[PDB]
Design a protein around this ligand. Sequence first.
Ligand SMILES: NC(=S)c1ccc[n+]([C@@H]2O[C@H](COP(=O)([O-])OP(=O)(O)OC[C@H]3O[C@@H](n4cnc5c(N)ncnc54)[C@H](O)[C@@H]3O)[C@@H](O)[C@H]2O)c1
Ligand SMILES: NC(=S)c1ccc[n+]([C@@H]2O[C@H](COP(=O)([O-])OP(=O)(O)OC[C@H]3O[C@@H](n4cnc5c(N)ncnc54)[C@H](O)[C@@H]3O)[C@@H](O)[C@H]2O)c1
Lengths: 333, 333, 333, 333
Amino acid sequence: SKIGINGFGRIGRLVLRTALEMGAQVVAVNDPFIALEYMVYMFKYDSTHGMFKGEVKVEDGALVVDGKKITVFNEMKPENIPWSKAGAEYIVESTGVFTTIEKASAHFKGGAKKVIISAPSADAPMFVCGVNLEKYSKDMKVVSNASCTTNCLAPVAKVLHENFEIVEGLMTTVHAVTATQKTVDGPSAKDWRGGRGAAQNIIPSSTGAAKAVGKVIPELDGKLTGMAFRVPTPNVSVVDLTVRLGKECSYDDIKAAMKTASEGPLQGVLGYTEDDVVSCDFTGDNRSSIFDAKAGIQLSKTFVKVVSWYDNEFGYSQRVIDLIKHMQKVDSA
Amino acid sequence: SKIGINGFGRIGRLVLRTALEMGAQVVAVNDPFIALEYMVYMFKYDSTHGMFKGEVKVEDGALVVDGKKITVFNEMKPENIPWSKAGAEYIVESTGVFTTIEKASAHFKGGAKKVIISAPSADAPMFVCGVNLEKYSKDMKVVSNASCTTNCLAPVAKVLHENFEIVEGLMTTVHAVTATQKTVDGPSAKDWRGGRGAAQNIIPSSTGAAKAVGKVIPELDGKLTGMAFRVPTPNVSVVDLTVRLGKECSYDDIKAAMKTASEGPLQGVLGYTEDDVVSCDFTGDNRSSIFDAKAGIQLSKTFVKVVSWYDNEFGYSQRVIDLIKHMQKVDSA
Amino acid sequence: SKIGINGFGRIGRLVLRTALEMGAQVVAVNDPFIALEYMVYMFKYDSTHGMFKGEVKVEDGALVVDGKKITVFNEMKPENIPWSKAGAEYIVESTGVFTTIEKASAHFKGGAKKVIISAPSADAPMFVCGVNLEKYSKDMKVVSNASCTTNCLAPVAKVLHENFEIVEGLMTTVHAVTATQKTVDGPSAKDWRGGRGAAQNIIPSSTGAAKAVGKVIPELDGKLTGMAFRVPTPNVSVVDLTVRLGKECSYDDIKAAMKTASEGPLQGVLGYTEDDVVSCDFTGDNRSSIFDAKAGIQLSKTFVKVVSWYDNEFGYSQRVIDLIKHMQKVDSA
Amino acid sequence: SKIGINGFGRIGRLVLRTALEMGAQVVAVNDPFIALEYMVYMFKYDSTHGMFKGEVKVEDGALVVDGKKITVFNEMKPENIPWSKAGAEYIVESTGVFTTIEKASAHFKGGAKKVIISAPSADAPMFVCGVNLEKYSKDMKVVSNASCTTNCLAPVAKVLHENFEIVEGLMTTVHAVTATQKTVDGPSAKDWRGGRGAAQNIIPSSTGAAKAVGKVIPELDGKLTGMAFRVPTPNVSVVDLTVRLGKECSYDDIKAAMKTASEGPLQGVLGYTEDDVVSCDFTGDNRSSIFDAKAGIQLSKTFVKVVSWYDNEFGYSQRVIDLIKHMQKVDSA
Ligand SMILES: NC(=S)c1ccc[n+]([C@@H]2O[C@H](COP(=O)([O-])OP(=O)(O)OC[C@H]3O[C@@H](n4cnc5c(N)ncnc54)[C@H](O)[C@@H]3O)[C@@H](O)[C@H]2O)c1
Ligand SMILES: NC(=S)c1ccc[n+]([C@@H]2O[C@H](COP(=O)([O-])OP(=O)(O)OC[C@H]3O[C@@H](n4cnc5c(N)ncnc54)[C@H](O)[C@@H]3O)[C@@H](O)[C@H]2O)c1
């Protein structure tokens, strides 16, 4: 696996935890802004996904988790990271700063062989496990895992589209509070609404997830768009998708299609439920998107509103490792 | 006005506050679960709408607000309340338990001329100020003022339908917590999701608002439907309407139809804004529906998503007094 | 173990989960207000302690958890519960209604052998594991496990008192939201502040925990008292104890005493930490009370403020089983 | 008044709002991180204190509030601001970055007569209206107004000390979230607990308030100390003071000393209440400290716990204008 992580942030730390679960191997981490003993603390304690059960300690300038030694670098510039030194080959780029092919290539300077951008990218090909891994080629050096929301929508859109055909659709993601928000009314020049107190408000916001689905599923390109609402919940969001279908159908055909997909080809990616669930029931859920059967409504044989849950960064993190696994498989074949 | 209120709850109490400003006259209140000295407290202090600025005190087994003497009864059953004794002709039924024409007719025993259900009714004619008040005739003894959400949607639907014709629409309301939810996971046999902790979850929920619009605007009957998401905010909700129009139009055309309506026929009922607003900016707002221009999005010339705000507690109260004033001008004409 | 539970509430359900963890045996449950299939749902999904990992299902009028069959009764009156038929001997009384020895004895009419009140009791002897179990005798038929807060304070007070002697102390428990609170301003005749919107306010409140410690540790009787503040957090509370000591000491002697106790005699009951913890780091913590070393302050050699965390009902639930285990040990000797 | 403000943040903005009511005169503002059209927005809309009722608009590169023309500068460094140009003599330093007499003296280059640090200073004389204003002399060029918490505590401490003598006390402040906290777990190298999600946790924190009272009331120097708990509320905090008095007294005696002080020497600064109040009942309150009689508790005749509220944003702002008015009456005398 020889995985390396650049940027020990919320995604970066969750990717590490996930790796330890799924048995993947992380050999080095790079973050110039977080001191070594502070990394231990941020990795150990997590307000949402709880206490890390296992041993975590600093030992000889390295981070030791459950006996596994992880080399730590503090380079501000990607080109200066000794990836090869630590034996890191597949780099998870999660700083949110080097998201373009050009910027991301600086990692090859240090010995890296592949770079996975854990965010949307203006030019790196984007992948959503279960939707388009068919497009991945061994000679792609830099790839993107899209966004948390795209990984939720894509699976659902794919199932709907391949069965009833999406003519057009509008989306709303009722989203949990994010790190770019503020506790109290403060300055946010790039997004005035985004600066208003997060715990007090419902905040209309943006999302590129709908457009992004147009890149992951080309036929849908230009047929979907959407927005978001930031609400005062700590974790877990939900996708409210309203679509106009090309084939007439009953809401039962839709539940059937989703259920079949979840047990078959999209198992582990798309979940299915008929229980009376609420956002908290999905904290720590592995799947990228869970179809809420009871929450959806159908107005006519071709006009329906479908609902799908997803744990923000947690399901996304499982997908990052999944993507790296598929890649290494195709890369060594 | 000679108004009487049954149910000194969130609405009952705010209708009184609103009445004291729009100059209406409340002469009697009735609530068994609230003692006289306790009413002084619940009316004076309000977590959401602030401390009441004015004099509120008990005097002669009566409630005295800024001089106004208000007779208080504590009956547990409607037909008991001696409305006639206090001189209460028009009754605001805001307990949420006697919503049908039958149950609400109880107040007639006490000597009440008319009854206004501050909630949707299964059989009492429903009204929405600015949308269908012309259908009200004096011979009507019991009327409904619909729900908070129907009052926000109807105005917006009227405008969209009158200008571009609504073919079909699906609505989602990101709603603030209500008195029927629970602070922590608790029992709610009729609505399992509804019993989940309201401070931690995004709770899918139902709503009849979209269908009710089918009763207020006959032409839209059966062309609208929706659902809700209960979020952790104390007050102020938003309607997310995804609609398919019959006439091709640009989003500028939609903004123009809205602004226009808010200056003429629906002024004071439908507001229009282009600011980067958030839910807290509407606490205490008098309008039934405030169109958020910047938040809306358009996919095609006939498929657009519209967003409108509403202070579910306050605005509805203002509309309750407004409905009574219209009724009395027609009843005494 | 032959444990039976009366009242499948928040405590009742957590006690069941805990029993399954600790390997205790629950053979029957009684709750007249919760339907059988609804019990499955409330046991499976928990907003705070998450999804129950394991199988849960209704089977032949019984509840089956991980293959273990649990008989379900729906008796409104304790005397009518067939405890003996289900083989239940130790009854966890968690309805909050039959908390006195007299009321609790009705369980013996159904065949029960012992009753543990999972709440304070006006007359049943009270126990706090690790503080006064020595006093328990096999012929006590009804006992109380005190409250969640007493189980947090008692351990800490015991360590402080036996080492430096508590002359007098005042306590404040900054407490998470409770089920007896309201989502929005509503009626609460027995507690006006307690009826104010829970998500919007800091609510001064009461606690009997200080007085109760006077019964668990007699020497401290009449030397402690306190209050509470209800804050908008879903789970986990913290005890802020200010005491005047009889022996002069340094804050280091205090940390030393707490650390020693946590590793020795109070292990599993009193935790100790020097990390920069926050309330969420304790969700799901087994201990009754965790001493926060860094949070405390000392003004003089005999005046100090000590801080201790506790997960509300979760640590308490582990203590209920612990108490039943000690009891059965002493009871069969 | 000729007031100028540096730092249009929560305080900067509220000081302007307060000034517009107490009739003070603000003639200039300065903030680099906020553009002119953005100031109109941040001042007009406020999540906590409501939408500003009045006219706010940009005009001639100037901010115009209800006619008042306010010159705007955007400098990044103090000594630059051309205060003299606008006619700003008294400067409210509310950036929180130039709190020392040295750093704050920068404003002197611009032609500023006096500077008031809207935060504690390490070396500028600290004042608390109603407690030590009699110690201010015109020869003072740079002064501090202490912190929100010191302003709540000092009044209460003065009264307790003057009447019963404070031997020693320990303070806990259950504080609302501030601009320096994070919405979700994020980096905060100088305060690890401080970086934890503010919407989910009770976060232990430090405070200098209790010691600062030692500087405002010299006699209490070294006899007071405390700490804080940051909770998920937008505004309004409470002081929980556990104090040991030198003279035996009853709680009635304490209530009487408080009520008395609030009608004479400390009226308008220290409030007194006996109602069942909660934090939201103090949003927008002008007083620095509101004594909550019902919440207090007494253990013995010399050991009592006192509780006092304060709207940390609003009340402090009012005190800032008050301090300037006192300074100008003395400066021009
Ligand atoms: N608050 C919002 S947002 C809103 C908006 C639109 C419509 N409504 C509807 O208005 C109704 C009341 O809502 P609410 O104000 O939130 O309720 P809330 O529970 O706050 O108040 C209801 C009041 O009814 C009183 N009451 C109960 N039973 C009786 C009785 N038998 N006789 C006399 N009084 C009684 C009770 O003491 C309580 O204060 C419900 O049907 C709602 O669905 C609420
Ligand atoms: N609300 C509470 S609790 C309270 C009470 C009393 C005092 N204070 C203190 O008052 C200070 C300001 O608080 P706040 O209002 O929350 O600040 P906040 O950070 O919200 O605003 C400060 C403003 O200063 C601006 N600024 C930064 N640097 C400069 C500069 N170099 N030149 C000119 N302008 C600049 C900046 O853009 C920002 O908008 C802090 O030190 C607080 O700790 C807070």
